[PDB]
Design a protein around this ligand. Structure first.
Ligand SMILES: NC1=NC(=O)C2=N[C@H]3C(S)=C(S)[C@@H](COP(=O)(O)OP(=O)(O)OC[C@H]4O[C@@H](n5cnc6c(=O)[nH]c(N)nc65)[C@H](O)[C@@H]4O)O[C@H]3NC2=N1
Ligand SMILES: NC1=NC(=O)C2=N[C@H]3C(S)=C(S)[C@@H](COP(=O)(O)OP(=O)(O)OC[C@H]4O[C@@H](n5cnc6c(=O)[nH]c(N)nc65)[C@H](O)[C@@H]4O)O[C@H]3NC2=N1
Length: 779
């Protein structure tokens, strides 16, 4: 049995594993990581925990009755263990049956999810590679993170903006005087990366503090970002940020402070927005006092902030929770409108940035080459012959339950109309929709429309528990791969070396899909005649050739593999100022909008005629909001990202012991809200509204503002009885309480943070948690 050390990486960073007798026993952070995540110990434990999936399983009802199975019992744990050969034969026959019977519109292959990094073992791209060979599939578009912002930005500034490099951290340290974290908690959300993280935000944040820059945080919760800086903390009622921004803009106009020259030369449509702001159009001037009545933030604080931003070099760093809500498109559109009025866009240290809290945005980029990986093949095909009727081949990701309930119905998206396809099977890998999607009770019933549901994962999540066919995948630590370090920085390239042998009967997603492609008669087309190391070497060799051209020297493949990593040099990346060339000469360097300027009023959006997405930033009432007129429930739930998980990942590990309260997901509650209900620290409470009910464990703190409770997304849904409609969730999946609606007709984004509920001390019968041990038949 092996003894020794091996270096690899993950969504949480680079590390060295210690192996003793063939088992990994410690993960130690990379010596060059400036700020390792405390979640690394849970990553190691996820390889071996009680919920690791050991064998291929088929739901007993599905095995016995196929398409005639009773579909309401999915999730009760009644599984049968089968051999790999039987399982692969069944999956392959079901994929082919559905493709022949219903066409490519019958298979949903969107499979949204965070999976693991790795250019070769990219389970979702491998899924689409196989489905392409099978005849086609319906895909998803956009994502759950910036579903609204990524669609409105191209109409305002011309590009996506949210996933683009920010003005560099060192430029901010030398030039910014006031830094604003608006609906952003960079300390919390910078621990992970899509590719391997370099944790570049931490040194950037430390340099701002050492310089004594004034930091302001606008967030209903007193986060570690607030605590690290001793920041001035503004706490708006959730979903009222647009009203605050309008009251700031109104103040800048009334006191005649705003930058008229910036507005005149770099923007379009401000004259059509002004009348709205002043109340000429609706008899309601959007003053600081009007904003105070909606948001609860004192009118004079709103005014002082507006003056301060106008007089100092200010960076408006905004996060994404405020656009993960009804009418989310207005939040960042109004933010950019406010930034335009301040006139600092394109100056070193000023303007705005939408990715300082995500994957190291602002960390200086190197001059290295880009690494490429396996593809789904669609780019070199001639896929399905598609046409309306059968419906759209792509849907906005968060409309997956609407699609299932309304096959053939039309939906709007960014100015076009499309039809939902009639899906009969879904194949999910690397994602956990029975945790990540909204309105769980609705989704549970809608899922009965699917004949067949196949899932691959290495943990028994609620999604795998609901499958008809469950196949055990390996982790990244049981295979070899290659990946970039740094989504924006491109710090280097890492060899993700195998640490231990595959556990139990687990197989990589690549091997499972290759075996399904082989039964479809298309094995060589899937594999390309290459094995694991052959694929990895060809990605490396391609990057090395690109590197050569550009003057970046890289070692041959085997020398790179022996070292385990290659790092690239930073040339001018540390001086990058976003929008500087636009500011310097807007005629030579225009934005990619219809006018070539920042569009405060959009004629294009005006033509779409959407009632829920007007042609300029607008305050509109959401479905439900804290203290809204006629609101039924009293507390807003901040259903934000978990500090000690990556969404649902790591919930079934030893780290859960450090935050669970009586075994359940924690609920943070203000002392006065607790006292009014007779709730004490540590009590189990029932959190409920008209869509669902869950149990959580309370931690009483004044870190959350009064009227707000914090229950993070990601908890593993553990239903008392899958056949009972609206059954109680014993663990605390906050998406049992959210509503499943689009942000607007423009983007159709999810509204996972538009949530109100009531809380009461739980006094019902004691409950047994069953989500963190495998189903009995899977032991
Ligand atoms: N540790 C960690 N775990 C993760 O699961 C994780 N997920 C990653 C992903 S996939 C993404 S897309 C990014 C998401 O990054 P994003 O900015 O969406 O993160 P959230 O945790 O949803 O919200 C950030 C802050 O917004 C505050 N907030 C909520 N509602 C409001 C509001 O109405 N107004 C204001 N002003 N603030 C509000 C919350 O209290 C929270 O502190 O995080 C990434 N980083 C992650 N880190
Ligand atoms: N209410 C609410 N508020 C929110 O703020 C919120 N955030 C949204 C956001 S921004 C996103 S990005 C989504 C995230 O939702 P997402 O489904 O991406 O969440 P994860 O828990 O990372 O699911 C990843 C799954 O892939 C598995 N996996 C990892 N590697 C592999 C592999 O190699 N092979 C296979 N077969 N499986 C693998 C993991 O074990 C895990 O179960 O949540 C969204 N949901 C949200 N809801």
């Amino acid at each position: 049995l092996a003894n020794g050390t091996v270096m690899s990486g993950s969504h949480w960073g680079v590390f060295t594993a210690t192996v003793e007798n063939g088992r990994a026993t410690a993960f130690t952070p990379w010596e060059k990581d400036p700020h390792p995540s405390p979640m690394l110990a849970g990553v190691l434990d996820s390889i071996y925990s009680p919920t690791r999936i050991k064998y291929p399983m088929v739901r007993r009802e599905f095995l016995e009755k196929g398409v005639n199975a009773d579909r309401s019992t999915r999730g009760n744990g009644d599984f049968v263990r089968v051999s790999w050969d039987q399982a692969l034969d069944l999956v392959a026959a079901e994929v082919k049956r559905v493709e022949e019977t219903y066409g490519p519109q019958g298979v949903f292959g969107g499979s949204y999810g965070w999976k693991s990094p790795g250019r070769l073992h990219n389970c979702t791209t491998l899924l689409r590679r196989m489905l392409t060979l099978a005849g086609g599939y319906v895909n998803g578009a956009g994502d759950y993170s910036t579903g609204a912002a990524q669609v409105i930005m191209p109409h305002v500034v011309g590009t996506l903006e949210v996933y683009e490099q920010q003005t560099a951290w060192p430029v901010l340290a030398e030039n910014t005087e006031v830094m604003v974290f608006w609906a952003a908690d960079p300390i919390k959300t910078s621990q992970i990366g899509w590719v391997i993280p370099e944790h570049g935000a931490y040194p950037g944040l430390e340099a701002l503090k050492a310089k004594g820059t004034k930091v302001i945080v606008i967030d209903p919760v007193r986060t570690k970002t607030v605590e690290f800086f001793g920041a001035e903390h503004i706490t708006p009622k959730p979903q009222t940020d647009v009203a605050i921004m309008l009251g700031m803009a109104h103040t800048l106009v009334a006191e005649d402070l705003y930058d008229k020259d910036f507005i005149a030369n770099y923007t379009s449509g401000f004259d059509k927005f002004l009348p709205y702001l002043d109340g000429e159009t609706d008899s309601t001037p959007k003053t600081a006092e009007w904003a105070e009545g909606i948001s609860g933030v004192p009118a004079e604080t709103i005014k002082e902030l507006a003056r301060l931003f106008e007089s100092k070099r200010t960076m408006l760093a905004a996060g994404w929770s405020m656009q993960r809500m009804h009418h989310g498109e207005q939040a960042h559109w109004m933010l950019v409108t406010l930034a335009s009025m301040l006139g600092q866009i394109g100056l070193p240290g000023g303007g705005f940035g939408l990715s300082y809290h995500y994957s190291g945005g602002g960390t200086p980029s190197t001059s290295g080459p880009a690494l490429a990986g396996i593809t789904d093949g669609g780019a070199a095909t001639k896929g399905p012959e598609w046409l309306a009727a059968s419906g759209a081949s792509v849907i906005p990701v968060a409309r997956v339950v609407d699609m299932l309930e309304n096959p053939g119905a039309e939906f709007d998206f960014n100015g076009t109309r499309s039809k939902f396809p009639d899906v009969k099977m879904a194949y999910w890998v690397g994602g956990n929709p029975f945790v990540h999607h909204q309105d769980r009770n609705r989704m549970v019933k809608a899922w009965e429309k699917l004949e067949t549901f196949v899932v691959h994962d290495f943990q028994w999540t609620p999604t795998a528990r609901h499958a008809d066919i469950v196949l055990p995948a390996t982790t990244s630590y049981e295979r070899n791969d290659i990946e970039t370090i740094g989504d924006y920085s491109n710090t280097g390239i890492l060899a993700m070396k195998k640490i231990v042998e595959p556990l139990y009967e687990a197989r990589s997603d690549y091997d499972i899909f290759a075996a399904v492609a082989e039964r479809l008669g298309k094995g060589k087309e899937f594999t390309e005649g290459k094995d694991e190391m052959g694929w990895i070497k060809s990605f490396y060799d391609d990057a090395a050739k690109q590197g050569k051209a550009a003057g970046v020297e890289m070692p041959a493949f085997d020398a790179f593999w022996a070292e385990g990593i290659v790092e690239f040099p930073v040339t001018d990346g540390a001086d990058f100022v976003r929008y500087a060339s636009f500011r310097e000469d807007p005629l030579l360097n225009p934005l990619g909008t219809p006018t070539g300027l920042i569009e405060i009023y959009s004629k294009n959006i005006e033509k779409m005629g959407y009632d829920d997405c007007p042609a300029h930033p607008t305050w509109m009432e959401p479905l439900e909001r804290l203290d809204g007129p006629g609101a039924k429930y009293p507390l807003h739930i901040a259903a934000s990202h978990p500090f000690n998980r990556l969404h649902s990942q790591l919930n079934g590990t030893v780290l859960r012991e450090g935050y669970a309260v009586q075994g359940h997901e924690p609920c943070l509650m203000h002392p006065d809200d607790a006292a009014a209900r007779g709730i004490a620290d540590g009590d189990v409470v029932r959190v409920h509204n008209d869509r669902g009910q869950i149990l959580t464990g309370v931690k009483v703190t004044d870190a959350v503002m009064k009227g707000v409770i914090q229950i993070y997304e990601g908890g593993w849904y553990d239903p008392s009885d899958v056949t009972e409609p609206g059954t109680l969730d014993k663990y605390g999946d906050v998406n049992v309480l959210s509503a499943d609606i689009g942000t607007s007709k423009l983007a159709q984004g999810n509204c996972g943070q538009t949530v109100l509920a009531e809380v009461e001390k739980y006094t019902g019968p004691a409950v047994t948690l069953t989500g963190f041990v495998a189903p009995k038949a899977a032991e």
